[PDB]
Design a protein around this ligand. Structure first.
Ligand SMILES: [K+]
Ligand SMILES: [K+]
Ligand SMILES: [K+]
Ligand SMILES: [K+]
Ligand SMILES: [K+]
Ligand SMILES: [K+]
Ligand SMILES: [K+]
Ligand SMILES: [K+]
Ligand SMILES: [K+]
Ligand SMILES: [Mg+2]
Ligand SMILES: [Mg+2]
Ligand SMILES: [Mg+2]
Ligand SMILES: [Mg+2]
Ligand SMILES: [Mg+2]
Ligand SMILES: [Mg+2]
Ligand SMILES: [Mg+2]
Ligand SMILES: [Mg+2]
Ligand SMILES: [Mg+2]
Ligand SMILES: [Mg+2]
Ligand SMILES: [Mg+2]
Ligand SMILES: [Mg+2]
Ligand SMILES: [Mg+2]
Ligand SMILES: [Mg+2]
Ligand SMILES: [Mg+2]
Ligand SMILES: [Mg+2]
Ligand SMILES: [Mg+2]
Ligand SMILES: [Mg+2]
Ligand SMILES: [Mg+2]
Lengths: 99, 82, 206, 101, 151, 127
RNA sequence: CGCGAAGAACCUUACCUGGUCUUGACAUCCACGGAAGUUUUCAGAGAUGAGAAUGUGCCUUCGGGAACCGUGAGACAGGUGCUGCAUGGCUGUCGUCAGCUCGUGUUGUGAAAUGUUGGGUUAAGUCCCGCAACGAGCGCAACCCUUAUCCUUUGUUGCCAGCGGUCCGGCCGGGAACUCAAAGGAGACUGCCAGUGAUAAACUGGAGGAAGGUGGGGAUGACGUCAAGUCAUCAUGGCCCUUACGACCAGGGCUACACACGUGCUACAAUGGCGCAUACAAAGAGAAGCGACCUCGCGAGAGCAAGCGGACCUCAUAAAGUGCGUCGUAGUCCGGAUUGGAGUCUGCAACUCGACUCCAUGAAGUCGGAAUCGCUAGUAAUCGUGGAUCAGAAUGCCACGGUG
């Protein structure tokens, strides 16, 4: 038995706060937390014509950076798994729970 | 080229051809379905195919079978440049 | 020369986004669409409430909207009579339960959106654009702004040929990324056409 | 972009999700390799024309949401190349920012 | 450049012979970034030259090379409405590059079968003062003597 | 014991383990000639060990990934040099004087907008 | 002039021929009638007309409203209709060139000047000196991203040095060393040395160092110029149409072809073609999606179907290279255009007008007149790979690595 949870955010400062917060929250409950693990970040890239009309040669390049983290809890006693369901995770981060 | 898993003819013309075979030969059967292939049941009929603005008449014979209807009705007119 | 717009050149350096939710490729297109519709609706019916910023957050499920207005009484109403009207009408636009906060701007003289639309309102009432222009600059500078420049353009004073007059005063280092430059734009709809207003407000470094 | 065009697109979407995505069996499991080479296959092929010319998902041009612009579409945001830059720049799109590398 | 006093990018020597001159020769001969093919051509042709001209592998390359090096070139200068071919003495490093470039360009316009066979024959008769490569040197010198009045 | 070194090049990264012994070179569980079919790559790899003439006195165990043959040969030379540093630390100057300490920081420049390549622009015509 | 268009078979589509509608395809207002939606037949090319089943959802504080449909009449709708020389917004350009101004003082009757000139110096109106100028602002530089070295923390799906196991496969136990991932730091400052220079600013050279003088690349576009471009993204002043310049439908057209130009791709061969064997990448994408293994097909593909919202699975076997053999300078074992036949796949549908496959055919072409274009280093040249648009449909565009 082991729970594995992933964190996706659009910025690294916000994911750091949530990660350091969840990680310590479990450690309070007596379990031993494995991680966190910085997974490679997926950076999408866009190029767009900026004139409404012609001038193809003048464009603009954008990007979305998706930061990712992984933590594993390997002895989920029957007070930890529920407790995680009531954490003040931020708005710009989302969590994924896997058992 | 389409598949060997069926040729293609439209219903609204398949009804007309099979309704017109027994009643004989009459005024040309007027259609817009340029995209429907030609069946052996059509031989000897006269069909007026669309070409954008008229219905040019084609008289179906045995050798024009398997061909789409459209390719006996050119859509562009061209007579030289000078 | 065409300048880069000053706000998003600094997004993630010294300025925050107005939307801070996360979503995968499936619903990214649809959160943006709802976010457009709610913002379109709020700015349409808070016209005289002097709303300067509408940030939208989308937690696990719900949506929360924070409004930055200089006259919170009109939007709050009595005991919150109409902010609930906003919440009920937002919730079905977004199709999700809503929770509206109301934040607060102390000095409307130091917010670009409020300065810009103040100038448009006077122009739409046929005020000599020099008076509106020169007045906003001096009001903002005596409240502590480190620099400001406003700019209007297009058939000024009912002319037949469009011009571009800009009054600058202070210090506005647009090329420095550390500078906290508040910029926003607005349009006035005159009987002779449309007139654009652009404002830059420099508050300080870092 | 000529509201009539906007009306066409919404009609096509509504007509597609009613007939097809459930009446797509007759173009898959009867246009299939089996002993139905009799009228079983032929009648399905003939029936598929009787359905409305629309409702075919290959007939929606995928316009922009805010303007109905038919060219320069970006699926990730659903907007055209014009409106994405305009909205990216004010800060409406989370995460998005000028990329240099 | 109007002001830059350029340095000099280093060049690795030959792998086989450790020669700083054949590294340039391979670079001159190579095309489209195919270094290996050029090394194969130069090596095979060089060893063919060695056994044809006796022995002494790379100084058989030198003896033909010394027969094609120019000593004076011509520079075209426009005076005021007429131009003159002022003859100017050639720099030391430029002497090799000119000598190598001429040999390679002449070792392309032949009727032989391979590039190795094509190049080896040019490298041979050049050591014997024959070939288009040595003619190019004769022509440049002959051109530069006719304008010795402008030196 | 063994001494370690990381060298890298265009896009490759090599890690090299040096041990006292006799000349033995293994790259990715293969011999030097079995790996590098390009003969100049062999000369590059050996260069530091011929300068500092510890060529027959060391085992080399090398693991390489990324890039192409010339990049891998370049990384190995840099990785060898750094490890050979960690052996003696007194023979640094002469390894510096041959340009082996310097980590070649050349990279393929990114394609730019409006140009067919990093710098090649399309043809320009007046009329 | 591979421009809008990041992808015209239908749609897109604005254009043409014909058939159709007039408060309207899109919205608000009133009156009236029907809960909607259904599930089917005929006529029609289809729009649309006819018709047969169908349901009666909720509060009723038991009058209606909900929401949807259909009819009536007008306020109005609608316009990719005109004016970019009435405008906004956005963009090109000179030009990433080093300039452009102001306040106060002073000079001149005045327009104006000065500062901003002069001696040096710099990539720079960069800096130092001098000086009726003294200061300041927008620009330059720095601040931002990426790359090059090192250090700390964490170790799965990533790694394997030391260990043992092993089916020889990091595959198992195991390890946190190493590559690597991604957060936080350190580092480069003419900082040190020597010389030159007006006891200056800065210049040359040396040390050290991963990197030396702006380390490499990017983003960043000053006051303004061209009445530059866009009224067909959008918004908008004026003008114009309202049984039509608005709306719906089928077929066509945007793909025509005497010709001329621009930008590309493939070649004219031996540094090469063909056949067999065999090495070494990086960056990306994926749910109405990516599709493995296996069976069938010469092939494109077909059948069954695991895995994956992904450092895990798939796309996906890099190609130039390398070894062997063959061809032997020939319009060729170069070239692969055109045309006939036979097919697969997407899609309601490939005639006009798709992509790809197999058999057959084998045009011009033997390095190109006057002239002209790009490029200073991981650059040019050359070899492949991915992505956006997208049902299908790149030699274009945007990115990535190899040799160099
Ligand atoms: K304009
Ligand atoms: K003055
Ligand atoms: K207008
Ligand atoms: K057509
Ligand atoms: K051409
Ligand atoms: K082309
Ligand atoms: K077609
Ligand atoms: K042939
Ligand atoms: K496609
Ligand atoms: Mg389509
Ligand atoms: Mg390249
Ligand atoms: Mg041009
Ligand atoms: Mg181009
Ligand atoms: Mg049509
Ligand atoms: Mg069409
Ligand atoms: Mg000046
Ligand atoms: Mg002066
Ligand atoms: Mg300055
Ligand atoms: Mg001065
Ligand atoms: Mg700068
Ligand atoms: Mg560690
Ligand atoms: Mg004009
Ligand atoms: Mg027009
Ligand atoms: Mg066209
Ligand atoms: Mg595959
Ligand atoms: Mg020939
Ligand atoms: Mg090629
Ligand atoms: Mg490609």
């Amino acid at each position: 038995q082991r729970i594995r949870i992933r964190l996706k955010a659009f910025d690294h400062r916000l994911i750091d706060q949530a990660t350091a917060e969840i990680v310590e929250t479990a450690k309070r409950t007596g379990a031993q937390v494995r991680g966190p693990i910085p997974l490679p970040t997926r950076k999408e890239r866009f190029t767009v014509l900026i004139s409404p009309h012609v001038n193809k040669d003048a464009r603009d390049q954008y990007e979305i950076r998706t930061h990712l983290r992984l933590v594993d809890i390997v002895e989920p006693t029957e007070k930890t798994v529920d407790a995680l369901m009531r954490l003040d995770l931020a708005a710009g981060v989302d969590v994924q729970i896997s058992l | 080229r389409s598949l060997k898993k069926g040729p293609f003819i439209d219903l609204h013309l398949l009804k007309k051809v099979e309704k017109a075979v027994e009643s004989g030969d009459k005024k040309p059967l007027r259609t817009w379905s340029r995209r429907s292939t030609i069946f052996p049941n059509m031989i000897g009929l006269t069909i007026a195919v669309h070409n954008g603005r008229q219905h040019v008449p084609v008289f179906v014979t045995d050798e024009m079978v398997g061909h789409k209807l459209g390719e006996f009705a050119p859509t562009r007119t061209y007579r030289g440049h000078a | 020369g065409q300048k880069v717009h000053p706000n998003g050149i600094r997004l993630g350096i010294v300025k925050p986004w107005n939307s801070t939710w996360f979503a995968n490729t499936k619903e990214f297109a649809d959160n943006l669409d709802s976010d457009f519709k709610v913002r379109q609706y709020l700015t349409k019916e808070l016209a005289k409430a002097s709303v300067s910023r509408i940030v939208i957050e989308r937690p696990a499920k719900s949506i929360r909207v924070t409004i930055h207005t200089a006259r919170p009484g009109i939007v709050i109403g009595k005991k919150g009579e109409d902010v609930e009207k906003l919440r009920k009408v937002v919730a079905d636009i977004a199709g999700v339960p809503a929770q509206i906060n109301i934040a607060e701007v102390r000095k409307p003289e130091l917010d670009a959106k409020l300065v810009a639309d103040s100038i448009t309102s006077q122009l739409e009432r046929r005020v000599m654009f020099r008076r509106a222009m020169k007045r906003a600059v001096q009001n903002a500078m005596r409240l502590g702004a480190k620099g400001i420049k406003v700019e209007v353009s297009g058939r000024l004073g009912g002319a037949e040929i469009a011009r571009t007059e800009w009054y600058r005063e202070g210090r506005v280092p647009l090329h420095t990324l550390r500078a906290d430059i508040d910029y926003n734009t607005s349009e006035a709809h005159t009987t002779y056409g449309v007139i654009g207003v652009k404002v830059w407000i420099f508050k300080g470094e870092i | 972009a000529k509201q009539s065009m906007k009306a066409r697109e919404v009609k096509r979407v509504a007509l597609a999700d009613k007939y097809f995505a459930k009446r797509a069996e007759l173009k898959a499991i009867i246009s299939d390799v089996n002993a139905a080479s009799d009228e079983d296959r032929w009648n399905a092929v003939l029936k598929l024309q009787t359905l409305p010319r629309d409702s075919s998902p290959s007939r929606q041009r995928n316009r922009c949401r805010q303007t109905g612009r038919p060219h320069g579409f970006l699926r990730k945001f659903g907007l055209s190349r014009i409106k994405v830059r305009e909205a990216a720049m004010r800060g409406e799109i989370p995460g998005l920012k000028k990329a240099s590398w | 450049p109007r002001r830059r006093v350029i340095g000099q990018r280093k060049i690795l020597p030959d792998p086989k012979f450790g020669s700083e001159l054949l590294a340039k020769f391979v670079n001159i001969l190579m095309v489209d970034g195919k270094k290996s093919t050029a090394e194969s051509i130069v090596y095979s042709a060089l060893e063919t030259l060695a056994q044809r001209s006796g022995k002494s592998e790379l100084e058989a390359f030198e003896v033909a090379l010394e027969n094609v090096r120019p000593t004076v070139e011509v520079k075209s200068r426009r005076v005021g409405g007429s131009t003159y071919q002022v003859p100017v003495e050639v720099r030391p490093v430029r002497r090799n590059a000119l000598a190598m470039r001429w040999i390679v360009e002449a070792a392309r316009k032949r009727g032989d079968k391979s590039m190795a066979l094509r190049l080896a024959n040019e490298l041979s008769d050049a050591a014997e003062n024959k070939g288009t490569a040595v003619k190019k040197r004769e022509d440049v010198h002959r051109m530069a003597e006719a304008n010795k009045a402008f030196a | 014991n063994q001494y370690y070194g990381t060298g890298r090049r265009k896009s490759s990264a090599a890690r090299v383990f040096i041990k006292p012994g006799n000349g033995k070179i293994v790259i990715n569980q293969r011999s030097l000639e079995q790996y590098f079919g390009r003969e100049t790559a062999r000369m590059v790899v050996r260069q530091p060990l011929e300068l500092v003439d510890m060529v027959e006195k060391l085992d080399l165990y090398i693991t390489v990934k990324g890039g192409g043959i010339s990049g891998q040969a370049g990384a190995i030379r840099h990785g060898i040099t750094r490890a050979l540093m960690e052996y003696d630390e007194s023979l640094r100057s002469e390894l510096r004087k041959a340009g082996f300490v310097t980590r070649d920081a050349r990279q393929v420049e990114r394609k730019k907008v409006g140009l067919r390549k990093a710098r090649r622009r399309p043809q320009f015509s007046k009329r």
